[PDB]
Design a protein around this ligand. Structure first.
Ligand SMILES: C[C@]12CC[C@@H]3c4ccc(O)cc4CC[C@H]3[C@@H]1CC[C@@H]2O
Ligand SMILES: C[C@]12CC[C@@H]3c4ccc(O)cc4CC[C@H]3[C@@H]1CC[C@@H]2O
Ligand SMILES: C[C@]12CC[C@@H]3c4ccc(O)cc4CC[C@H]3[C@@H]1CC[C@@H]2O
Ligand SMILES: C[C@]12CC[C@@H]3c4ccc(O)cc4CC[C@H]3[C@@H]1CC[C@@H]2O
Ligand SMILES: C[C@]12CC[C@@H]3c4ccc(O)cc4CC[C@H]3[C@@H]1CC[C@@H]2O
Ligand SMILES: CC(=O)N[C@@H]1[C@@H](O)[C@H](O)[C@@H](CO)O[C@H]1O
Ligand SMILES: CC(=O)N[C@@H]1[C@@H](O)[C@H](O)[C@@H](CO)O[C@H]1O
Ligand SMILES: CC(=O)N[C@@H]1[C@@H](O)[C@H](O)[C@@H](CO)O[C@H]1O
Ligand SMILES: CC(=O)N[C@@H]1[C@@H](O)[C@H](O)[C@@H](CO)O[C@H]1O
Ligand SMILES: CC(=O)N[C@@H]1[C@@H](O)[C@H](O)[C@@H](CO)O[C@H]1O
Ligand SMILES: *[C@@H]1O[C@H](CO)[C@@H](O)[C@H](O)[C@H]1NC(C)=O
Ligand SMILES: *[C@@H]1O[C@H](CO)[C@@H](O)[C@H](O)[C@H]1NC(C)=O
Ligand SMILES: *[C@@H]1O[C@H](CO)[C@@H](O)[C@H](O)[C@H]1NC(C)=O
Ligand SMILES: *[C@@H]1O[C@H](CO)[C@@H](O)[C@H](O)[C@H]1NC(C)=O
Ligand SMILES: *[C@@H]1O[C@H](CO)[C@@H](O)[C@H](O)[C@H]1NC(C)=O
Ligand SMILES: CCCCCCCCCC
Ligand SMILES: CCCCCCCCCC
Ligand SMILES: CCCCCCCCCC
Ligand SMILES: CCCCCCCCCC
Ligand SMILES: CCCCCCCCCC
Ligand SMILES: CCCCCCCC
Ligand SMILES: CCCCCCCC
Ligand SMILES: CCCCCCCC
Ligand SMILES: CCCCCCCC
Ligand SMILES: CCCCCCCC
Ligand SMILES: CCCCCCCC
Ligand SMILES: CCCCCCCC
Ligand SMILES: CCCCCC
Ligand SMILES: CCCCCC
Ligand SMILES: CCCCCC
Ligand SMILES: CCCCCC
Ligand SMILES: CCCCCC
Ligand SMILES: CCCCCC
Ligand SMILES: [Cl-]
Lengths: 332, 332, 332, 332, 332
């Protein structure tokens, strides 16, 4: 086989067409899976197939018939091939069981297909200010390590038709949508200009799960604190334990939510809602302290419902409704 | 040894029978263990033996007697062998202590057995909507990396008798059952058609553990909230603390369950049961607020059991029974 | 050195005595440490020295005197050596700092000692039904990868004297005892019969730690629930808060134990004890609801201690004693 | 290509200019990302590009025109290159997908550019005494492993213009600022003097997040404990449960904060604030015990507000204000 | 360079002075960092420089002047070097970025310096019975893998001056002190006697952090339980809720401490203190049950402070003081 290719007779340390125009190299990608995601480290992991296409007259071979020849990674060391790398990647590797998952297919005309299977972890900067109502966009980037656009020209072989994605692709914690491709020119002052390829996608959460587990309990506890305004002010051993036990219950709820969340140490939209609800419950405990004190002062001086309860029955609900209208107009 | 095989005289970069019909290659598998499983990453890990069978006249050798010859991984580099890989795998490796766990056995006729020991991690997409009453099915897949069915024909050597599983195979968190084999043809537009082999199995949970730890406590707390309807309405400092302390107790139970569960952020069958029980307890606290208010209004106007308690003693249990009948007809 | 051994003149791809009887190979082991253990993955990790002994006339060398020659891993590649592997192992490796921890010692007669230092992780199936009163037994297994008993005969060189264990060997969470060796013949239908070597040991827990942290608190809370039967039935605002706060306290205890335990999702001996104690406390809350209701009915009809308290003072302790006697006769 | 360079004719085991003055080697760095940080292990991880510049007459080549030649890691093994390493690093690696991310560019004059992409984890000693108001400074260090300043002279090629940082660089838990470069001479008694290069940066936290989650709840609970001084001393079943339930609520808050914090086992500024607030709440429970006892003694002897309440209404708030003024003058 | 050394003319598979006396080899160590520590696995991780010194006449070279020659890891494969390994180590590796961090310096006389940078993880058996007042001692050990003292003699080159430690060495959770060196002879029955080198150090904790977080809260809760003896026995709805809420508060404290501690499943000094404090609080709840029962019996028979309170006011504090004196005389 390797005697028909004239491997011993050519310098394969240099590209096709050296000293002349650039070599055009086309690319396809097939995404096999999304493997995990980390919100505190801000990265994601992906497994894919990567395919390259070009022509080299040094590899043309005589044949009576149109049959191609096929080789593995042991030929790759002896000929020239393109030099792609993944930009902004944290780590990656090429699969090797039961042997190296790499292939070369060569036509009698000297056209080449070069194919490999690979796993990569890449960074994706995330903003959690609107959590849990946030939306994140991420991308994977491809570039030549050593050749500027004067020597190698890199492009998507079929436009957006160059990207395929597995029919069963999913994540346990997110909804994935809107896969599409783009390109852009980039500059490095030590070397010059390069073309870069992009794969783009969007992530979203299951909203009703978070509403049920977080917003609904806090709202129910605020409503229980209002029941106190309808209990007789003479029942001190009933009015006093109800308040402080409601404060304890709101406190344990907020502690459990904090223990369950990812460790992102800045203020988020759900934080604001919980601490405002805590303040409403605290203020209901100050209301009865005022009522009891003034009742006692009148009983002492002088020796039906009090006006403060009458007003609280109206004012506490109205204020909480106003808060909710503003909050949901901000976070939509 | 390696001079009887005519290694220096043949091109082992190409398959047996090249330019003619396909080479048939048979396969056996012996599963040694299931090593771990991840529900948030959606994958499982397995260790196994993989065995391959074929014939190659280039490896036939003269002998007076029927003795075979046996070799290790140092021959594999010099001859031709099949090119299997594990489809949809996240990572894998071949064992190498005290040396490479690889073997080749060759008959005087040129029949070959090729054997190796390997560990693989593979993806298995899971749905947790019915948790803890869910059932999961998983599979492992085997294919040639470079040869279509025009050049290599891949098959199970003995039918379903080709698969063996270790007598002590188990998992700490699941029951495993129904190991069996299948095959299917697959298509890639850049190359053509391939045959693929499958190993299939099913996973189930220990149901009574989850009933005892999750459903039983919530049911007991709902029943304690009903005790209030049988206590004298005049005892305000008894009726009021009982309710709010029952709400606190249900809240700490739900927080502990949430902290213990895998981090799958969508709504599950057990979530529904817990939040409905929370609402039943909240409504029992509103019932006495009504009774106490109306009692106070009559005492003020005018200066035995109340009808609301009489009805609640009947209506709250009946409604919870109706809920349970519907719920268990849905989740079965 | 390597010119006295006639390395260039012999085929070291095949065993001593090929075409004749089997080569006997003796083995010693010295355990250096037990490194970790996992209860949810069901495996353990160990570091050891492994030593092999045999004779090969191809390695005999002329000498005036009884001095042996000593070599490192660079000779191992050029001669024949045995092919041992660890059965049912998850992963393993051979140490290489400051160089490969491998040695060969050769006598003028052609006797060889082959020695290496290695770390291995191996599976050990565990049953936790009796936890914390469980006992586990584990073993490590050694075998030839390619040679049946017709070609290689594997044995412990000195009987049980072949195994040594480090004087400071320990685990943070277990007591280790009863190290001993065994052997057994095993069969594979594709190849034939093999002899296998075993190292065996036993694991146990610190019982009084678990009694103090788990059984003692639950027993104290059951006894506090009984104090209620000695408090005046007229004190409704005292009898009612005591019960529901005891239920809350038992609930937080059980939640903490569940959060601390390994994630084995089936029912264990300690689970049974905790949920029976929870039911005893719940039933003490139903007792006073009956007493208060019937007292109120008589006061209404008609307009000293009640018999139900008198009987409960005797019956609740007797029943709990009976439960404990049965339980400890079952789990011993 | 490699025949124009006279690789076979020169000893590339030794530096340019050996037996004469030192070889000057210039350096640039481009930071691609900060990848993670650990507060308990005291280290950080970074990915970067590293570039080296020097001249070697042995690599000058004849040409009619000013075109450079470009090579990969397969030339690096055959010529001389500098020997940089990262001082005080825990681990590091050079990227290799789809091939080694290493490049050599050579001019006809014999000037060389040597470039590679690398990930490193480095130690950064941290002090948490002022947490959460702490500020940390970290640095990365570069040096030659084998050559003193008598043989190799190492320097930043353009001053502070030699360092570039990615426009999207960020961390989930910190604010990063003030990237700048320095150099310093270092001494080893076994070999001599070396020049070392430094990259320096500063880290800070989001202060208002920690104020909201930690300081605000403790302050609200101290204020609720003061409400008791305004409730009638005759209401024993109201005054007594309020105190002990406030103590319980402060206790659960402190436990949640401790469970959420990194495991640094020495006293921190936020610890001091929480335990002082706990003591204020405890002392409010002792105040009413005194009032109730003395009231009972007078009622017994003899058979309006008490002076202790009157004074507590003034003294407890004044003392807590004084504490806050001192504390915030210390931690600023 | 490598032609002045007569590499092709000498057998570097054997030591200097073979068939004669032993080769003396001297050693220095420079500790760069302590990298982490694990209390449940019982090990620690360290990074260091290791340096070796010896003489070999086969490496003497002619020179007019006193200049040494310097080489990297590519010479190490061709000559003889010592064979050190780290005894009782779990894992280790040698650094390789931007190339292998290994160096050889050779004098014209044939004296050699051999130097490398390395990271190692080593076991250190720990006892936690006195926690948090425990003290731990650890050591790292160095030995030849293949040569007994008849062939190689290993020693510290300068006594205790052979060990240096970095001026900024620290751990987040411990105080480190008392670094010093020792040596000892060791015996293996299969080979003979070897000399071993030791590096020794000591670890201690920050005591006042643990006192503040663990012992102080439990002591305050015991003192609050005593307040009950000073409240009027007629106030049943005050005396009864105070006790059971104090029991709940002690229970949540102990649960939080247990959740925060390393998972060492045997009894520790701090365990004893917490469960004794729990028993004191339980006994204060039994005291009032007795007082209330006997008061009720006298009121029934017959139809000021009770003696049991009078005695409890003295006896409970005295007993707790006695316990503390004994406990701190035991744990010091
Ligand atoms: C602020 C809290 C303590 C400090 C915790 C912390 C501390 C350090 C850090 O880097 C992240 C976090 C995230 C969760 C934080 C906690 C959430 C609740 C708790 O009060
Ligand atoms: C919804 C909760 C907070 C957010 C938690 C979270 C947050 C992010 C995420 O990716 C997964 C989870 C799983 C558990 C969730 C928690 C369960 C209880 C808590 O209220
Ligand atoms: C059953 C609980 C929720 C589900 C938890 C779980 C869920 C899934 C799983 O694989 C293991 C475990 C172990 C601990 C379990 C918890 C123990 C307490 C809690 O109620
Ligand atoms: C001191 C606590 C128990 C011991 C815990 C521990 C124990 C050992 C250790 O190395 C670190 C820590 C950090 C958190 C500590 C806990 C914080 C709260 C708890 O009381
Ligand atoms: C004993 C507890 C349950 C069992 C827990 C366990 C269980 C198994 C194990 O190997 C270690 C530990 C450490 C912490 C233990 C817990 C401490 C508190 C809890 O009650
Ligand atoms: C080169 C090209 O056609 N690019 C398009 C892009 O503009 C578009 O946004 C995407 C789908 O939205 O499909 C692709
Ligand atoms: C080719 C063949 O025989 N396949 C069968 C499959 O149909 C069956 O489902 C399984 C056991 O259920 O056993 C196998
Ligand atoms: C071959 C042989 O002697 N085996 C014995 C084994 O039977 C015994 O159980 C063990 C110690 O119990 O010591 C060993
Ligand atoms: C050699 C040199 O110019 N060093 C400077 C340094 O002094 C300065 O602190 C820093 C920015 O603050 O910029 C750089
Ligand atoms: C050989 C020698 O001098 N060893 C000493 C050792 O005895 C001493 O304990 C240590 C410091 O304490 O310093 C070193
Ligand atoms: C196909 O191959 C035949 C030789 O068998 C050749 O004559 C013909 O030109 C080829 N056609 C193409 C399109 O390559
Ligand atoms: C077995 O080997 C003998 C030679 O010893 C040969 O004559 C015979 O044909 C062989 N039989 C088979 C079935 O291979
Ligand atoms: C020991 O070596 C001597 C040669 O020095 C030899 O004569 C003698 O037979 C040897 N003895 C044994 C037991 O090997
Ligand atoms: C550029 O190259 C030309 C040859 O094409 C040469 O004559 C000229 O001197 C070069 N100039 C520089 C600045 O190198
Ligand atoms: C130093 O080198 C000179 C040669 O330049 C030599 O004559 C002299 O003896 C050497 N001295 C020592 C102490 O090695
Ligand atoms: C299953 C969806 C439950 C949604 C509850 C939302 C509550 C929000 C209260 C403001
Ligand atoms: C040991 C099995 C316990 C099962 C309890 C199930 C309770 C379900 C209540 C609806
Ligand atoms: C230190 C040992 C403590 C043992 C307590 C066991 C309590 C069991 C109650 C049934
Ligand atoms: C969103 C910022 C909230 C800051 C609260 C600070 C409270 C401090 C009390 C002393
Ligand atoms: C900051 C140091 C605090 C020490 C408190 C110790 C309390 C011990 C009570 C027995
Ligand atoms: C917390 C609200 C207090 C309102 C007091 C009104 C006095 C007239
Ligand atoms: C909630 C505020 C009540 C204010 C009442 C004022 C009555 C004069
Ligand atoms: C639980 C609903 C009770 C409704 C009572 C209506 C009495 C007229
Ligand atoms: C605990 C059961 C008490 C039953 C009392 C029956 C009195 C007639
Ligand atoms: C906790 C404060 C007690 C003050 C007592 C004052 C007695 C005159
Ligand atoms: C909080 C201290 C109060 C002291 C009151 C003293 C009255 C004589
Ligand atoms: C705490 C023990 C009190 C014992 C009182 C005995 C009175 C006769
Ligand atoms: C607790 C504050 C009461 C104020 C009454 C006017
Ligand atoms: C708390 C609401 C009471 C309504 C009474 C009609
Ligand atoms: C899927 C929700 C079912 C609810 C049954 C009451
Ligand atoms: C709560 C049930 C009471 C039954 C009285 C007979
Ligand atoms: C609880 C102590 C009371 C002291 C009264 C003077
Ligand atoms: C709860 C036990 C009371 C005993 C009275 C003598
Ligand atoms: Cl009352």
């Amino acid at each position: 086989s390797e005697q028909l290719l004239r491997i011993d007779d050519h310098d394969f340390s240099m590209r096709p067409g050296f000293g002349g125009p650039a070599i055009p190299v086309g690319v396809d990608v097939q995404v096999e899976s999304l493997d995990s995601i980390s919100e505190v480290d801000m990265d994601f992991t992906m497994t894919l197939y990567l395919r390259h296409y070009w022509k080299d007259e040094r590899l043309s071979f005589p044949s009576t018939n149109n049959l191609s020849m096929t080789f593995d990674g042991r030929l790759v060391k002896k000929i020239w091939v393109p030099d792609m790398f993944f930009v902004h990647s944290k780590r990656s590797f090429i699969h090797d069981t039961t042997t190296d998952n790499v292939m070369l297919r060569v036509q009698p005309d000297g056209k080449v297909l070069y194919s490999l299977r690979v796993t990569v972890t890449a960074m994706c900067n995330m903003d959690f200010s609107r959590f849990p109502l946030d939306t994140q966009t991420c991308s994977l980037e491809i570039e030549s390590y050593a050749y500027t656009e004067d020597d190698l020209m890199l492009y998507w072989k079929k436009g957006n038709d160059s990207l395929k994605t597995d029919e069963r692709i999913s994540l346990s914690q997110f909804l994935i949508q809107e896969f599409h491709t783009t390109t852009k020119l980039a500059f490095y002052s030590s070397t010059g200009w390069y073309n870069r390829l992009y794969i783009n996608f969007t992530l979203r959460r299951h909203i009703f799960f978070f509403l049920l587990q977080t917003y609904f309990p806090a709202t129910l506890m605020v409503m229980l604190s209002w029941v106190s305004f309808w209990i007789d002010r003479r029942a001190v051993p009933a009015r006093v334990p109800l308040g402080i036990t409601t404060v304890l219950t709101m406190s344990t709820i907020i502690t459990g939510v904090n223990a369950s969340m990812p460790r992102v140490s800045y203020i988020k939209a759900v934080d604001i809602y919980l601490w405002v609800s805590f303040v409403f419950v605290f203020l209901s405990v100050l209301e009865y302290a005022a009522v009891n004190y003034l009742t006692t002062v009148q009983e002492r001086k002088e020796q039906d419902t009090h006006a403060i309860d009458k007003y609280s029955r109206i004012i506490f609900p109205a204020a909480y409704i106003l808060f909710n209208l503003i909050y949901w107009s901000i976070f939509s």
